[PDB]
């Protein structure tokens, strides 16, 4: 997708990382048809040394590891991400995503 | 269509978004664990992509269907429609890519099977490949015989580069490019590669240069075409830059010469220079461990064999001989085939001056440097060696010179007349000229101090006794101080004794005295009198086990290889450093990750050994396999199950945590329930900061026994695991272990770091006090004097080790000397009456 | 693409705005001490920006971006736009200049690595070249082997004049160019490089003079073309004036000579004359130490040689 | 900016340097977002030659040097200087600057 979705996602990462549940999103996207044998998590695994800082704030980066990945695909994924948030029901983030387009 | 060609087309998509390292399914028979698991340690997504697309491409075609059709399609729907489309429809671009790749394989017929792709060089090449200007050129060089042709083929098959070049690739081997017709025929053949048509009327044989510039003009004018805007001309083994001066046709050409002369002319900005004689260029022997798999295809036999660094020609031919005895064909065989190629590239040298001098060079040891004077005897000489350096042969450096072992030993030792008489009489004469009134010569550190031994053993014995200075004493000072060692001096002393027995016994006693340890040298020589060392020391004045160092900061973690031979040393400048005990041969200087200050642990026998730093983490590693295996960060003192059958890695975090895990598995088994902690056979002693001990049950995990140490005002087990010690402020208290309840105190300064040993109840306090044989008295003070302050000591079973000073200098001492010889004395405080002297 | 080549596009803009004197925002990593000392002392920021750009291209490709993306930020705002936009987009004429300069560097491969830019004589050179007239020419003398072959290569590398030159430049190593046949094959090379197509039916071996006149007329016809309005012809080590008399095509050409007689023949008014045997035309010890460092490649031993001035 | 701006500043430098106070315009422009401390140091440094002539011929030359600097520096030199001169309340200078426009 164009760079506008890139900038929108990177800017609203800090917000959609908290509005939508990480597990409820990832476990809804793996069945959605993006993250499989070739992609799976790529977020539950990290550089290998995240334990210097505590798990409560660790989650904040783990879910941060998800959205930054979702941007890397082609033009469909953005709208597919729309669809993903439609499964999330945290639609206050879905409308925030919508606001940058249309 | 094919199902093994469509994957490389989406290598762009794979690098962009795909990472096969999030897999938790990996259906075993999908791929061998080793291949996919060494992709886990891939440097980046590009490296993982390359590793996967090479290992998977090595697999058979029908298995990729299980890879894709069902394993990938767990619930994907996303990027399998393009792959399946390419399998069935196959775009014209993709079809031409596959056809061109198949044509190349069909042209080489040897790279299709005998390729083991080297990730590092291709990785360092393809970024320049993708940014090549429509007329810029790329140079690849290094050392010849490095299989650079195979590297070029590896980068050639890449989908990205073929797309960028639009499959306009033409390979020309630049063999024998030292004659006008030899390049003229290459011009015609490359023209016909572009198009087998020629307006040959302009060919005027009055000057072959006339025709060569005419055809160069024709090639230039045709190359300026829209289909010909991006073309890749491979120039295999460029002979000289002169040939390129005709082959410079202003295009995206890649030339890979094998001569040091060619690379110098080309500008790095104009031509991105690439060399192959690098550690990174050399990758790992694990890269070539599959050579017997590409040739003989026998995985188990690879372990019995031992592969070397990146030498595809020599190593490949040795393996080919091996498959057609591993050891017989390793060295003895290949003397007629490997030599054929090793001096096949030589033949360009004229022998009147070049080959004669190179043969003269054979007398020098296989891996040795050389002073300029010595080669001069055997500026014409320096001009000759300089041009030889230019071609391919000799490496030059500031102002000695090193010579590669490949051309020094095998090529010329087999074919060598007896010029050795003159060479060795000169090798005798020059050190005779290197004689003074005293015994201090202007010896050169590398060649002289090392190979004077070789040459003097070579000539005769009286020279051997005289100039080694073991009859004298100056060798012991000069060599050792200038070599900072003792191992090299011993390695000279031992094998050279063959060149009279009366002096052979004396020098044998010298050799014995050598590992045992101006005015100092004469004083120590005075100790030995039957040896003529003090005899020489008189003229000079009128006119402990072993040692280590190799380091940059401050001695941390002293250990012992269970099986009498290795030290898992380690220091403070992040670097590894492991060593032999009877050799000190630095075996692996490998920075784990955080060389700080804490601890190391072994296992029951071997195969795991990581030392936790001050970043909680206690990462583990293998033995001679070295490469760190386990990353563990949650943490302090943890020990392996003392039973050899149960590999239970008992772990201890903070807040009295009890994680337990079998090393054979990757997950903690038991996670039940702060300064230092221990387990028992149902009890847990931990000590913490209040300096009062705490004793818990493994089963109920509450407070039951508190030793306040009763004298407030570090825990470790013994040779029976029955004697835990509690260190508190100023007390050592032998705590129990599900057998009894408290044993001994022994009325012990603050205990800095006191630990146990591995035997007879005795434990070690270090260096405040000495060896206290608990259950009570003190035997030794590390038993071999001080030689300053710190010097470690322990007993694994019956051999001893322990390496950690502070001043970069750890020392291995032994029980036998005992009784603290020089330091157990009357201290600094004394008064003197010059009576003799009553002191 | 590359940050290295695009900077030469905007030197004028820097000369327009970049102070080169008041811009003190020291990057210790890239901007050195002695070179900033020299950057302060330059007579202006036209030449100042010039040898500044020389020092910048001396640094590696990425190393300079730190200056132009964040170090430039505090003291300037415009310049990032006109350089980063070209870094991505790369205009067509700029790209053409890029391939042309790369062709020239690939033509040498030796001056491409061992060069040192003699500032002031080159300054005079390209200054005279600003008002280069379609009929005018430039004589460059000096004793043979004084590197005037080097500075002649350098002076055409300038972005501004090359763009003004419409990127058509050709060279002719006039070694042993004193035969009626030599001029023949040289003009045949001219004919090919101007156009790899011609009519050979006028080949008249009865007279080398007749055929040389015929090819001269053909090339004169070629040059009087809109695509051939301003094409440079370099005459490298002109042997004798007769070569030029065969070469005077009334074009934007020039020549460097080995001989005093060549310069003596040409009229100064009709032909701009530049020498090297002059107090400012020679090399300052700074240029000398730079050139010796091009080979020695270590400053610690650079101090160990402070004698030669040849 | 168009060359007409710069040419107008050059030809009308005398009147502008006459009207505008040096320190007041300097502080207003550096606050306006036009100068930094480094560049204003050199701007007030004038030439170093300020030593040999009188002080009376230093401040004016410093001010004209400032004018010459602020010809092209600044994202909108014309507009931002117009604003700064309006802030000066030396509005004759501001309107003289605006004269070359419209």
Q: Which residues touch B568 (CB under 8 Å, ≥6 apart)? A: B557, B559, B560, B561, B578, B600, B602, B609, B611
**Six token digits for residue C2:** 């590359």
For B402, the 3-state DSSP assignment is strand
**Six token digits for residue B269:** 């900005």
Does the CA dihedral C278-C281-C285-C291 come out positive or negative? negative
CA pair distance B118, B291, nearest whole angstrom = 12
**Six token digits for residue B382:** 């320096």
- CA C246 to chain centroid: 25
CA distances from B515 to B491, B508, B811 (A): 12, 12, 12
- Residues B217, C191: contact at Cβ < 8 Å? no
Beta bridge partners of B677: B686
Q: Which residues touch C146 (CB under 8 Å, ≥6 apart)? A: C276
CB contact C294 to B (< 8 Å)? no
- Residues B426, B178: contact at Cβ < 8 Å? no
CA pair distance B42, A45, nearest whole angstrom = 14
CA atoms within 13 A on the CB side of B223: 25
CB contact C44 to D (< 8 Å)? no
| CB within 8 Å: A36 and B78 | yes
Q: Which helix (H) or strand (E) holds B429?
A: helix B420-433
| Residue written as token pair 């978004």 | B17
- Residues B394, B403: contact at Cβ < 8 Å? yes
CA pair distance A21, C252, nearest whole angstrom = 73
Q: B24: which chain A residues are within 8 Å (Cβ-Cβ)?
A: 40-41
Question: Which residue in B34, B165, B182, B191 sits closest to B97, CA to CA?
Answer: B165
The shortest C-alpha distance from C67 to chain B (Å) reads 21
The shortest C-alpha distance from D35 to chain C (Å) reads 8
What's phi and psi for B553, nearest 5 deg?
-110, -90
CA distances from B452 to B5, B369, B431, B466, B481 (A): 61, 13, 8, 12, 17
CA pair distance C192, B334, nearest whole angstrom = 54
CB-based burial label for B612 (10 Å; 0-12, 13-18, 19+) = buried
CA pair distance C293, C207, nearest whole angstrom = 53
CA distances from B49 to B42, B54, B777, D25 (A): 9, 8, 64, 61
For C24, the closest of D38, D69, D73 (CB atoms) is D38
CA pair distance A19, A80, nearest whole angstrom = 18
CA distances from B383 to B364, B372, B420, B679 (A): 20, 11, 24, 72
Interchain contact D/A (3 or more Cβ pairs less than 8 Å)? no
CA pair distance B789, B780, nearest whole angstrom = 15
Question: What chain D residue is nearest to C24 in terms of C-alpha separation?
Answer: D38
- Integer-rounded Cα Rg, in Å, for chain B is 35
For B14, the 3-state DSSP assignment is helix
Instruction: Fill in the DSSP letter of residue B272.
Output: E
CA pair distance B287, B277, nearest whole angstrom = 16
The shortest C-alpha distance from B135 to chain C (Å) reads 7
- Residues B384, B349: contact at Cβ < 8 Å? no
CA pair distance B583, B768, nearest whole angstrom = 30
Rounded-to-5 percentages of helix, strand, coil across chain C: 55, 10, 35
For B75, the closest of A31, A45, A49 (CB atoms) is A31
CB-based burial label for B717 (10 Å; 0-12, 13-18, 19+) = buried
CA pair distance B629, B618, nearest whole angstrom = 11
Residues of chain B numbered 234-263 and touching chain C (CB < 8 Å): 248, 250
Best residue in B74, B593, B594, B632 for a mutation probing chain A (most A CBs within 10 Å): B74
- Residues B540, B785: contact at Cβ < 8 Å? no
Question: What chain A residue is nearest to B12 in terms of C-alpha separation?
Answer: A73
CA pair distance B149, B130, nearest whole angstrom = 19
**Six token digits for residue C158:** 């300038």
- CA B820 to chain centroid: 40
| CB within 8 Å: B267 and C105 | yes
Q: What would the DSSP string read from start to end of B358-397?
A: HHHGGGS-TT-EE-HHHHHH--HHHHHHHHHHHHTS-EE-
Q: A51: which chain B residues are within 8 Å (Cβ-Cβ)?
A: 616, 633-634
CB contact C61 to B (< 8 Å)? no
CB contact B71 to A (< 8 Å)? yes
Does the CA dihedral B224-B227-B229-B233 come out positive or negative? negative
Starting from the edge strand earliest in sequence, which strands make up the sheet with B771-773, in order? B754-756, B763-765, B771-773, B777-780
Beta bridge partners of B620: B630
| CB within 8 Å: D72 and C21 | no
Instruction: Fill in the DSSP letter of residue C229.
Output: S
| Residue written as token pair 């075409």 | B225
CB contact B631 to A (< 8 Å)? yes
CB contact B77 to A (< 8 Å)? yes
Best residue in D1, D38, D70 for a mutation probing chain C (most C CBs within 10 Å): D38
CA pair distance B693, B711, nearest whole angstrom = 12
CB contact B28 to A (< 8 Å)? no
Instruction: Fill in the DSSP letter of residue C70.
Output: I
Distance between the two ends of chain D, CA-based, in angstroms? 15
CB-based burial label for B174 (10 Å; 0-12, 13-18, 19+) = buried
CA distances from B628 to A45, B288, B631, B797, D38 (A): 18, 21, 8, 27, 52
Distance between the two ends of chain A, CA-based, in angstroms? 15
Q: Which residues touch C62 (CB under 8 Å, ≥6 apart)? A: C3
CA distances from B573 to B554, B589, B594 (A): 8, 11, 9
SS3 assignment for B85-145? HHHHCCCHHHHHHHHHHHHHHHHHCCCCCCCCCCHHHHHHHHHHHHCCCCCCEEEEECCCC
State the structure-solving technique. Answer: cryo-EM
- Residues B723, B742: contact at Cβ < 8 Å? no
| CB within 8 Å: A37 and B74 | yes
Q: Any long-range contacts for B72-80 (C-beta under 8 Å, 24+ apart)?
A: B72/A36, B72/A37, B72/A38, B73/A36, B74/A36, B74/A37, B74/B25, B75/A30, B75/A31, B75/A32, B75/A33, B75/A36, B76/A33, B76/A34, B76/A36, B76/A37, B76/A38, B77/A33, B78/A33, B78/A34, B78/A36, B78/A73, B79/B10, B79/B13
The shortest C-alpha distance from C44 to chain D (Å) reads 13
CA pair distance B153, D50, nearest whole angstrom = 70
CA distances from B753 to B141, B727, B728, B742, B768 (A): 55, 9, 12, 21, 9
CA pair distance B570, B804, nearest whole angstrom = 9
For B678, the 3-state DSSP assignment is coil
For A49, the closest of B73, B76, B633 (CB atoms) is B633
Residues in chain A: 102
Beta bridge partners of D27: none
Beta bridge partners of B256: B140, B236
Question: Which residue in B660, B697, B663, B701 sits closest to B680, CA to CA?
Answer: B697
Q: Which residues touch B576 (CB under 8 Å, ≥6 apart)? A: B570, B588, B589, B590, B591, B592
| Element counts in chain B: helices (H) and strands (E) | 32, 22
CA atoms within 13 A on the CB side of B490: 15
Instruction: Fill in the DSSP letter of residue B700.
Output: T
| Residue written as token pair 């977020």 | A43
| Residue written as token pair 């639009």 | B166
Beta bridge partners of B234: B171, B254
- Residues B568, B595: contact at Cβ < 8 Å? no
For A39, the closest of B22, B616, B631 (CB atoms) is B22
Q: A32: which chain B residues are within 8 Å (Cβ-Cβ)?
A: 75
**Six token digits for residue B817:** 């000397």
CA distances from C221 to C172, C187, C188, C195, C228 (A): 20, 13, 14, 12, 10
CA pair distance D34, D80, nearest whole angstrom = 8
| CB within 8 Å: B270 and C196 | no
For C102, the closest of B133, B217, B220 (CB atoms) is B133
Instruction: Fill in the DSSP letter of residue B201.
Output: G
Q: Which residues touch B242 (CB under 8 Å, ≥6 apart)? A: none
Q: Which helix (H) or strand (E) holds B172?
A: strand B169-173
| Residue written as token pair 């196959």 | B90
- Residues B458, B426: contact at Cβ < 8 Å? no
SS3 assignment for chain A? CCHHHHHHHHHHHHHHHHHCCHHHHHHHHCCCCCCCCCCCCCCCCCCCCCCCCCHHHHHHHHHHHHHHHHCCCCHHHHHHHHHHHHHHCCHHHHHHHHHHCC
CA distances from C245 to B829, C171, C193, C272 (A): 104, 17, 21, 17
| CB within 8 Å: B72 and A45 | no
Q: D38: which chain C residues are within 8 Å (Cβ-Cβ)?
A: 22-25, 74-75
Question: What chain B residue is nearest to C185 in terms of C-alpha separation?
Answer: B210
Q: What would the DSSP string read from start to end of B578-647?
A: -EETTT--B------S---SS-----SSSS------SSS---B--STT-S--B-----EEEEE-SSSS--
Best residue in C12, C13, C21, C22 for a mutation probing chain D (most D CBs within 10 Å): C22
Question: CB neighbours (10 Å) of residue C59?
Answer: 17
- Residues B126, B152: contact at Cβ < 8 Å? no
- β pairing state of B137-141 and B271-275: parallel
Does the CA dihedral C4-C6-C12-C17 come out positive or negative? negative
- Residues C254, C137: contact at Cβ < 8 Å? yes
How many angstroms is the resolution? 7.0
The shortest C-alpha distance from D62 to chain C (Å) reads 14
Q: What would the DSSP string read from start to end of C78-147?
A: TTHHHHHHHHHS--HHHHHHHHHHHHHHHTTSSHHHH----HHHHHHHHHHHHT--TT--EEE-S-TTSS
CA pair distance B154, B111, nearest whole angstrom = 9
Best residue in A28, A36, A44 for a mutation probing chain B (most B CBs within 10 Å): A36
- Residues B684, B678: contact at Cβ < 8 Å? yes
Strand segments, DSSP code E, in B276-421 are 369-370, 395-396, 401-402
The shortest C-alpha distance from C23 to chain D (Å) reads 7
Q: B250: which chain C residues are within 8 Å (Cβ-Cβ)?
A: 103, 106
- β pairing state of C168-173 and B648-652: unpaired
Question: Which residue in B367, B356, B352 sits closest to B417, CA to CA?
Answer: B356
The shortest C-alpha distance from D39 to chain C (Å) reads 6
CA pair distance B216, B191, nearest whole angstrom = 10
Cβ pairs C/D, distance under 8 A: 29
CA pair distance B701, B709, nearest whole angstrom = 21
- Residues B296, B323: contact at Cβ < 8 Å? yes
Q: D39: which chain C residues are within 8 Å (Cβ-Cβ)?
A: 19, 22-23, 75
- Residues B715, B724: contact at Cβ < 8 Å? yes
- Residues B637, B677: contact at Cβ < 8 Å? yes
**Six token digits for residue D52:** 């040999």
Strand segments, DSSP code E, in B280-358 are none
Question: Which residue in B129, B3, B119 sits closest to B50, CA to CA?
Answer: B119
| Greatest Cα pair distance in chain A | 42
| CB within 8 Å: B221 and C105 | no
Question: CB neighbours (10 Å) of residue B103?
Answer: 12
Q: C108: which chain B residues are within 8 Å (Cβ-Cβ)?
A: 267
Question: CB neighbours (10 Å) of residue B602?
Answer: 17
Interchain contact A/B (3 or more Cβ pairs less than 8 Å)? yes
**Six token digits for residue D97:** 């600057």
| CB within 8 Å: D39 and C21 | no
Q: A42: which chain B residues are within 8 Å (Cβ-Cβ)?
A: 19, 21-22
For C207, the 3-state DSSP assignment is coil
Question: CB neighbours (10 Å) of residue C13?
Answer: 15
For D36, the closest of C17, C21, C74 (CB atoms) is C74
| Residue written as token pair 């080995």 | C258
- Integer-rounded Cα Rg, in Å, for chain D is 13
- Residues B569, B578: contact at Cβ < 8 Å? yes
For B75, the closest of A30, A48, A51 (CB atoms) is A30
Question: Which residue in B404, B406, B400, B409 sits closest to B447, CA to CA?
Answer: B400
Beta bridge partners of B171: B234
- β pairing state of B683-686 and B694-697: antiparallel
For B323, the 3-state DSSP assignment is helix
């Amino acid at each position: 997708m164009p760079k506008r979705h890139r900038e929108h996602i990177r800017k609203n990462l800090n917000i959609l990382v908290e509005w939508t549940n990480y597990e409820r999103l990832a476990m809804e996207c793996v069945q959605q048809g993006i993250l499989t044998v070739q992609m799976l998590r790529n977020t539950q695994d990290l550089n290998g040394k995240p334990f210097n800082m505590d798990e409560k704030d660790v989650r904040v980066e783990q879910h941060r590891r998800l959205l930054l990945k979702i941007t890397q695909r082609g033009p469909t994924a953005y709208n597919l991400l729309i669809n993903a948030l439609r499964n999330i029901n945290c639609l206050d983030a879905a409308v925030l995503l919508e606001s940058v387009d249309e | 269509y094919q199902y093994k060609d469509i994957l490389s087309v989406f290598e762009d998509a794979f690098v962009d978004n795909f990472d096969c390292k999030d897999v938790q399914d990996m259906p075993k028979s999908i791929l061998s664990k080793e291949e996919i698991d060494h992709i886990i340690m891939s440097k980046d997504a590009v490296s993982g992509t390359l590793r996967l697309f090479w290992t998977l491409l090595s697999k058979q075609e029908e298995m990729v269907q299980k890879f894709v059709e069902e394993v990938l399609r767990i619930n994907y729907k996303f990027l399998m429609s393009p792959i399946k489309t390419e399998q069935r429809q196959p775009s014209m671009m993709t079809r031409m890519y596959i056809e061109q790749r198949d044509r190349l394989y069909n042209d080489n017929q040897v790279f299709a099977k005998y390729n083991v792709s080297r990730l590092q060089p291709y990785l360092k090449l393809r970024q320049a490949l993708l940014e090549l200007r429509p007329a810029k050129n790329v140079l690849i060089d290094g050392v010849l015989g490095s299989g650079k042709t195979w590297v070029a083929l590896d980068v050639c098959l890449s989908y990205k580069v073929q797309c960028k070049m639009d499959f306009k690739i033409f390979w020309l081997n630049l063999k024998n490019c030292n004659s006008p017709e030899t390049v003229l025929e290459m011009l015609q053949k490359l023209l016909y590669q572009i198009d087998p048509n020629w307006t040959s009327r302009s060919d005027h044989s009055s000057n072959i240069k006339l025709r060569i510039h005419s055809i160069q003009a024709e090639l230039r004018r045709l190359l300026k075409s829209k289909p010909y805007e991006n073309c890749l001309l491979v120039l295999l083994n460029v002979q000289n830059a002169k040939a390129w001066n005709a082959f410079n046709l202003s295009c995206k050409i890649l030339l890979t010469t094998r001569f040091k002369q060619v690379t110098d002319f080309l500008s790095a900005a104009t031509t991105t220079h690439i060399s192959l004689d690098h550690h990174s260029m050399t990758l790992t022997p694990d890269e070539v461990k599959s050579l017997l798999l590409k040739y003989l295809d026998c995985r188990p036999q690879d372990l019995p064999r031992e592969v070397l660094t990146t030498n595809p020609r020599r190593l490949s031919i040795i393996a080919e001989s091996i498959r057609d005895a591993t050891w017989d064909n390793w060295k003895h065989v290949n003397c007629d085939k490997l030599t054929t190629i090793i001096e096949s590239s030589l033949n360009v040298l004229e022998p009147a001056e070049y080959r004669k001098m190179f043969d003269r060079l054979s007398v020098f040891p296989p891996s040795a440097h050389i002073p300029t004077i010595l080669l001069s005897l055997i500026s014409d000489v320096m001009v000759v060696v300089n041009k030889l350096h230019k071609y391919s042969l000799v490496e030059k450096q500031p102002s000695t010179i090193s010579i590669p072992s490949i051309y020094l030993e095998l090529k010329v030792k087999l074919e060598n007349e007896y010029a050795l008489h003159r060479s060795i009489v000169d090798h005798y004469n020059i050190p005779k000229t290197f004689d003074s009134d005293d015994l201090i010569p202007p010896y050169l550190d590398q060649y002289f101090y090392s190979h004077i031994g070789h040459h003097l053993k070579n000539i005769e014995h009286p020279e051997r006794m005289t100039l080694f200075r073991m009859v004298f004493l100056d060798f012991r000072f000069l060599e050792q101080k200038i070599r900072h060692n003792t191992l090299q001096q011993l390695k000279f002393y031992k094998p050279y004794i063959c060149d009279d027995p009366k002096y052979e016994r004396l020098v044998n006693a010298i050799l014995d005295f050598l590992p045992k340890i101006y005015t100092d040298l004469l004083r120590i020589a005075l100790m030995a009198e039957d040896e003529a060392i003090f005899e020489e020391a008189h003229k000079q004045v009128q006119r402990d086990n072993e040692g280590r160092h190799a380091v940059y900061l401050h001695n941390d973690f002293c250990l012992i290889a269970l099986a009498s031979g290795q030290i898992l040393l380690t220091d403070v400048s992040l670097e590894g450093e492991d060593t032999y005990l009877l050799r000190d041969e630095s075996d692996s200087s490998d920075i784990l990750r955080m060389a700080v200050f804490n601890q190391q642990k072994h296992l029951i026998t071997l195969h795991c050994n990581g030392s936790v730093k001050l970043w909680s983490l206690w990462p583990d590693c293998p033995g001679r396999r070295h490469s760190g295996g386990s990353k563990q960060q949650l943490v302090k003192r943890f020990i392996g199950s003392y039973a050899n059958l149960k590999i239970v890695a008992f772990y201890l975090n903070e807040d009295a945590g009890l994680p337990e895990a079998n090393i054979q598995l990757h997950v903690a088994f038991i996670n039940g329930d702060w300064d230092e902690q221990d387990q028992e056979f149902s009890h847990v002693p931990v000590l913490k900061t209040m300096q009062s001990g705490i004793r818990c049950f493994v089963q109920v995990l509450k407070r039951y026994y508190v030793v306040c140490t009763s004298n407030c005002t570090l825990h470790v087990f013994n040779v029976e695991n029955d004697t835990p010690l509690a260190l508190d402020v100023f007390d050592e208290r032998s705590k129990t272990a599900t057998v009894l309840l408290i044993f001994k105190y022994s009325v012990w300064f603050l205990p800095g770091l006191s630990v146990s040993l591995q035997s007879e109840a005795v434990q070690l306090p270090e260096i405040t006090c000495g060896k206290r044989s608990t259950d009570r008295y003190l035997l030794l003070g590390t038993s071999e004097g001080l030689i300053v302050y710190d010097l470690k000591i322990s007993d694994p079973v019956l051999r001893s080790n322990v390496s950690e000073h502070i001043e970069c200098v750890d020392i291995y001492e032994l029980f036998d000397p005992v009784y603290k010889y020089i330091v157990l004395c009357g201290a600094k405080g004394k008064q003197v009456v010059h009576v003799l002297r009553s002191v």
